[PDB]
Design an enzyme around this catalytic site. Structure first.
Site, mmCIF file in Angstrom:
data_model
loop_
_atom_site.group_PDB
_atom_site.id
_atom_site.type_symbol
_atom_site.label_atom_id
_atom_site.label_comp_id
_atom_site.label_asym_id
_atom_site.label_seq_id
_atom_site.Cartn_x
_atom_site.Cartn_y
_atom_site.Cartn_z
ATOM 1 N N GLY A 204 0.821 -1.221 0.000
ATOM 2 C CA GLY A 204 0.000 0.000 0.000
ATOM 3 C C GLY A 204 0.846 1.259 0.000
ATOM 4 N N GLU A 205 0.204 2.424 0.028
ATOM 5 C CA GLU A 205 0.927 3.715 0.093
ATOM 6 C C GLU A 205 0.223 4.712 1.012
ATOM 7 O OE1 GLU A 205 0.271 5.263 -4.390
ATOM 8 O OE2 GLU A 205 1.090 3.257 -4.008
ATOM 9 N N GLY A 206 0.874 5.855 1.196
ATOM 10 C CA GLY A 206 0.366 7.036 1.898
ATOM 11 C C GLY A 206 0.906 8.303 1.254
ATOM 12 N N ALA A 207 0.581 9.444 1.861
ATOM 13 C CA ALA A 207 0.757 10.811 1.322
ATOM 14 C C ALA A 207 2.215 11.029 0.927
ATOM 15 C CB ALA A 207 0.294 11.845 2.330
ATOM 16 N N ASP B 155 -6.466 8.521 13.435
ATOM 17 C CA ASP B 155 -6.897 7.986 12.116
ATOM 18 C C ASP B 155 -7.221 6.500 12.253
ATOM 19 O OD1 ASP B 155 -7.663 8.262 9.487
ATOM 20 O OD2 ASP B 155 -5.651 8.501 8.622
ATOM 21 N N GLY C 59 4.825 8.315 1.142
ATOM 22 C CA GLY C 59 5.636 7.110 0.874
ATOM 23 C C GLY C 59 4.858 5.859 0.477
ATOM 24 N N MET C 60 5.499 4.702 0.622
ATOM 25 C CA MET C 60 4.972 3.381 0.219
ATOM 26 C C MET C 60 5.402 2.318 1.243
ATOM 27 S SD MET C 60 5.802 1.455 -3.353
ATOM 28 C CE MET C 60 5.073 2.766 -4.334
ATOM 29 N N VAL C 61 4.566 1.304 1.470
ATOM 30 C CA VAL C 61 4.882 0.150 2.360
ATOM 31 C C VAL C 61 4.949 -1.141 1.512
ATOM 32 C CG1 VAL C 61 2.413 0.036 3.082
ATOM 33 C CG2 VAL C 61 4.123 -1.170 4.398
ATOM 34 N N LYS D 88 8.064 0.191 5.539
ATOM 35 C CA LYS D 88 7.336 1.421 5.186
ATOM 36 C C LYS D 88 8.388 2.469 4.836
ATOM 37 C CE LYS D 88 4.382 4.774 7.621
ATOM 38 N NZ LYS D 88 3.255 4.853 8.570
HETATM 39 C C1 LIG Z 1 3.001 -2.494 8.772
HETATM 40 C C2 LIG Z 1 2.202 -3.452 7.953
HETATM 41 C C3 LIG Z 1 2.469 -4.812 8.105
HETATM 42 N N1 LIG Z 1 1.772 -5.772 7.430
HETATM 43 C C4 LIG Z 1 0.863 -5.313 6.514
HETATM 44 N N2 LIG Z 1 0.150 -6.343 5.770
HETATM 45 C C5 LIG Z 1 -0.836 -6.012 4.738
HETATM 46 C C6 LIG Z 1 -1.766 -4.996 4.958
HETATM 47 C C7 LIG Z 1 -2.691 -4.719 3.971
HETATM 48 C C8 LIG Z 1 -2.687 -5.447 2.772
HETATM 49 F F1 LIG Z 1 -3.565 -5.176 1.795
HETATM 50 C C9 LIG Z 1 -1.785 -6.475 2.537
HETATM 51 C C10 LIG Z 1 -0.854 -6.731 3.539
HETATM 52 CL CL1 LIG Z 1 0.289 -7.981 3.232
HETATM 53 N N3 LIG Z 1 0.552 -4.000 6.267
HETATM 54 C C11 LIG Z 1 1.229 -3.081 7.010
HETATM 55 C C12 LIG Z 1 0.843 -1.677 6.783
HETATM 56 C C13 LIG Z 1 -0.296 -1.264 6.066
HETATM 57 N N4 LIG Z 1 -0.355 0.137 6.125
HETATM 58 C C14 LIG Z 1 0.700 0.556 6.843
HETATM 59 C C15 LIG Z 1 0.945 1.945 7.035
HETATM 60 O O1 LIG Z 1 1.565 2.518 7.947
HETATM 61 N N5 LIG Z 1 0.344 2.598 6.060
HETATM 62 C C16 LIG Z 1 0.267 4.031 6.011
HETATM 63 C C17 LIG Z 1 -0.888 4.414 5.128
HETATM 64 O O2 LIG Z 1 -1.883 4.836 5.958
HETATM 65 C C18 LIG Z 1 1.459 4.568 5.312
HETATM 66 C C19 LIG Z 1 2.254 3.715 4.550
HETATM 67 C C20 LIG Z 1 3.307 4.305 3.871
HETATM 68 C C21 LIG Z 1 3.621 5.659 3.968
HETATM 69 C C22 LIG Z 1 2.805 6.474 4.744
HETATM 70 CL CL2 LIG Z 1 3.171 8.152 4.872
HETATM 71 C C23 LIG Z 1 1.703 5.941 5.404
HETATM 72 C C24 LIG Z 1 1.511 -0.526 7.266
#
Ligand SMILES: Cc1cnc(Nc2ccc(F)cc2Cl)nc1-c1c[nH]c(C(=O)N[C@H](CO)c2cccc(Cl)c2)c1
EC number: 2.7.11.24
Length: 346
Positions: A22-25, A139, A27-29, A44
Site C-alpha cells: 500500500g501507500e500514503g501521502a 486515524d 511514501g509506500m509500504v 514502510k
Molecule cells: C506495517 C504493515 C504490516 N503488514 C501489513 N500487511 C498487509 C496490509 C494490507 C494489505 F492489503 C496487505 C498486507 Cl500484506 N501491512 C502493514 C501496513 C499497512 N499500512 C501501513 C501503514 O503505515 N500505512 C500508512 C498508510 O496509511 C502509510 C504507509 C506508507 C507511507 C505512509 Cl506516509 C503511510 C503498514
C-alpha cells in the site's frame, strides 16, 4: 537497488524480495524478506523532509511506536537511513508482516457476531494502551487495523498520532483536519482545535457499524456534508449538547439547521446483537464528554467473554508535555529524526 512501482527501496542486502502492500501521502509500504532473521517483514518507506508537517508526523510516529510494547499495536523491529544527515532523504521503518487489513476483509467476507465481538475487543485493548500513554491515534479506520491468519489484530499507521498530556489545556493548539472523513467525530468539525482522545472512540463506533453492515455508516462526500450524514441518523443535537459547545460560531451554525429525528439503530441494523447496538450508541454519542471512554467500553456486556483487566496492559511510562514541543523548523526536525534512528546504526 530493488524498485516497487517506480519507488527505489534502498534496504541494503539484509532485506530483499519487495512486494507492494500500500501507500500514503509521503511514501509506500512493502513486504520483504529479512535474510538475517529468516522471516518476512513489512517495510514502510517515508520521504517527508521537503514538508514540515510530514517531518513532525515522522518524528511522532517513531518516538511513539518505539516506546509502545503491546500485542494489538504494530511495533518497529528496525529503521534504515543514510549514515550522514546530508544524505538522509528517506527513512525505512521495518515492522512485523500482517496478512490483510479490516478494509480488505470486509470486501470479501460478512463476519460472524463472534468475529465482530473479538475484533472490537482487540481494537479497544490496544486503544486502552494508546490512551493510557496520553496518545491520540487520530486515524482509526479499517485500513489501519491489520489482521493475520489466526484472527489476531494490530493497530497500525501512527503517522497522525500525537501526545496530549491531560495535565495541560490543549484547547486551541491541536491540528485542525485530522482523521479520515467518514470516521471523523463531529467536534473535529465544530471544535476543530479543542477535541480529545474521545475522537478515537467515535472512530471505533464507525468501524463497529461498518463491521455490522459491510457498509460505512457516515459516507460524507465533503466537509460540511459529513456533519449532515451524522445528524441524518443521530437526529439534531439536544439543547444540553448545544450548551456543551463553547464555540459560539458553531453553536449558531447548528441552530440554523432544519430539525432531523434520531433513526433507531435496530432499523439500520435489524439482524444485529442488541448489546452490539447498545455499545455502538454509547460510542456514536454526539457530545464528546458523555461518549463512552475506553475502559467503560471494554467493561460493556457485549465484550464480557473477553473482558479481563488483569490481561489488559497500560503504558509503564506515559508521555508528558516535554515530549510534545515539535513546533520547530523542518531542518531541526530532520536532526531530531537522525538522533531517534541512531540506536539502529552500526
Ligand atoms: C506495517 C504493515 C504490516 N503488514 C501489513 N500487511 C498487509 C496490509 C494490507 C494489505 F492489503 C496487505 C498486507 Cl500484506 N501491512 C502493514 C501496513 C499497512 N499500512 C501501513 C501503514 O503505515 N500505512 C500508512 C498508510 O496509511 C502509510 C504507509 C506508507 C507511507 C505512509 Cl506516509 C503511510 C503498514
Amino acid at each position: 537497488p530493488e524498485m516497487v512501482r517506480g519507488q527505489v527501496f534502498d534496504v541494503g542486502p539484509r532485506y530483499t524480495n519487495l512486494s507492494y502492500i500500500g501507500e500514503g501521502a509521503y511514501g509506500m509500504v512493502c513486504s520483504a524478506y529479512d535474510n538475517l532473521n529468516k522471516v518476512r517483514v513489512a517495510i514502510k518507506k517515508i520521504s517527508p523532509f521537503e514538508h514540515q508537517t510530514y517531518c513532525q508526523r515522522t518524528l511522532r510516529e517513531i518516538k511513539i511506536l518505539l516506546r509502545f510494547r503491546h500485542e494489538n499495536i504494530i511495533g518497529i523491529n528496525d529503521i534504515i537511513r543514510a549514515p550522514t544527515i546530508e544524505q538522509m532523504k528517506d527513512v525505512y521503518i521495518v515492522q512485523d508482516l500482517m496478512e490483510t487489513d479490516l478494509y480488505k476483509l470486509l470486501k470479501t467476507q460478512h463476519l460472524s457476531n463472534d468475529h465482530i465481538c473479538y475484533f472490537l475487543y482487540q481494537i479497544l485493548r490496544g486503544l486502552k494502551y494508546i490512551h493510557s500513554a496520553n496518545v491520540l491515534h487520530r486515524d482509526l479506520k479499517p485500513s489501519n487495523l491489520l489482521l493475520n491468519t489466526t484472527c489476531d489484530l494490530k493497530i497500525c499507521d501512527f503517522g497522525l498520532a500525537r501526545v496530549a498530556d491531560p495535565d495541560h489545556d490543549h484547547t486551541g493548539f491541536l491540528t485542525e483536519y485530522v482523521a479520515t472523513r467518514w470516521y471523523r467525530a463531529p467536534e473535529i468539525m465544530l471544535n476543530s482545535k479543542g477535541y480529545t482522545k474521545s475522537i478515537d472512540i467515535w472512530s471505533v463506533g464507525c468501524i463497529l457499524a461498518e463491521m455490522l453492515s459491510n457498509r460505512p455508516i457516515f459516507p460524507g462526500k465533503h466537509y460540511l456534508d459529513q456533519l449532515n450524514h451524522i445528524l441524518g441518523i443521530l437526529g439534531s443535537p439536544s439543547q444540553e449538547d448545544l450548551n456543551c459547545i463553547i464555540n459560539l460560531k458553531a453553536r449558531n451554525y447548528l441552530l440554523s439547521l432544519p430539525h432531523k429525528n434520531k433513526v433507531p439503530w435496530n432499523r439500520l441494523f435489524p439482524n444485529a446483537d442488541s448489546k452490539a447496538l447498545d455499545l455502538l450508541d454509547k460510542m456514536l454519542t454526539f457530545n464528546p464528554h458523555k461518549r463512552i471512554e475506553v475502559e467503560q467500553a471494554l467493561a460493556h456486556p457485549y465484550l464480557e467473554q473477553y473482558y479481563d483487566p488483569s490481561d489488559e496492559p497500560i503504558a509503564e511510562a506515559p508521555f508528558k508535555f516535554d515530549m510534545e514541543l515539535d513546533d520547530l523548523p523542518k531542518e531541526k526536525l530532520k536532526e531530531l529524526i537522525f538522533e531517534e534512528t541512531a540506536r539502529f546504526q552500526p
